Ligand binder design. Structure first.
Ligand code: SKM
Length: 258
């Protein structure tokens, strides 16, 4: 089967390196190649893909919304986040999926015991935040809380979740078992001792919030696992097989060192 990643730029993508490691562990005769698609040539996307006989592809900067009109169908999750990172070519039909959020959430699940009873705060109300909150909503029993600087951003949200501003997150910070920053931030001055602090970025390997949270002697978690888990989730969709998460993360790490 033939896979890819589209984007502009595409050369620093670690998707092919990673999906390949997965193919070699599963003993699969797949290719996964980086495809450079400038904005100016994006209108010819159906043709760039189909001439290469592509089965499924990831979509990254700056085409995650740009791809949407070319899809024949799109899932609720993508539609909701308003962005597509995965497309399935399934008998000439293009179908758009979004695995970033489930990708972050499946990673967290592994490194956080009993996430179903977790008091989770998320910072940010934009699209990455939305995608994670949708996925959590399905597995977390206690109501989610999303904090944002502007209340209006929640108008197109769809969840029955608590929605607060940033100063109110600061002063109730100790009610939370996990905090997830999706913002590129708060005062950690009421930060409970046990609280896990997470950012969906892994370059830099630690953002300011994670730095300070670590000095306060808290557990921290960056976006590395999100990146592996979103691609693993694309792979499940495309192929109906189980990805080797350890092989995929180990190669990305080795590449990151160096
Ligand atoms: O750098 C990459 O190759 C990617 C990064 C993220 O945007 C992912 O959402 C995308 O599926 C692939």
């Amino acid at each position: 089967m033939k896979f890819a990643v589209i984007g502009n730029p595409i050369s620093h993508s670690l998707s092919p390196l990673m999906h390949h490691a997965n193919f070699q562990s599963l003993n699969l005769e797949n290719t996964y190649e980086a495809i450079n698609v400038p904005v100016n040539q994006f209108q010819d996307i159906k043709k760039i893909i189909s001439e290469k006989s592509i089965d499924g592809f990831n979509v990254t900067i700056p085409h995650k919304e740009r791809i949407i009109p070319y899809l024949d169908d799109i899932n609720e999750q993508a539609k909701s986040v308003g962005a597509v990172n995965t497309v399935l070519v399934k008998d000439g039909k293009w179908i758009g999926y979004n695995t970033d959020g489930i990708g972050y959430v499946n990673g967290l699940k592994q490194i956080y015991e009993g996430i179903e009873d977790a008091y989770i705060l998320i910072l940010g109300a934009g699209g990455a935040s939305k995608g994670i909150a949708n996925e959590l909503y399905k597995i977390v029993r206690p109501t989610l809380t999303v904090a944002n600087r502007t209340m209006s951003r929640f108008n197109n949200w769809s969840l029955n979740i608590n929605k607060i501003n940033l100063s109110h997150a600061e002063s109730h910070l100790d009610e939370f078992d996990i905090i997830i920053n999706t913002t590129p931030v708060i005062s950690l001055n009421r930060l409970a001792s046990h609280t896990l602090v997470s950012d969906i970025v892994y370059n830099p390997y630690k953002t300011p919030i994670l730095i300070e949270a670590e000095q306060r002697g808290n557990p921290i978690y960056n976006g590395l696992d999100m990146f592996v888990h979103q691609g693993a989730e694309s792979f499940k969709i495309w192929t109906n097989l189980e990805p080797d998460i350890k092989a995929m993360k180990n190669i990305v790490i080795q590449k990151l060192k160096g």
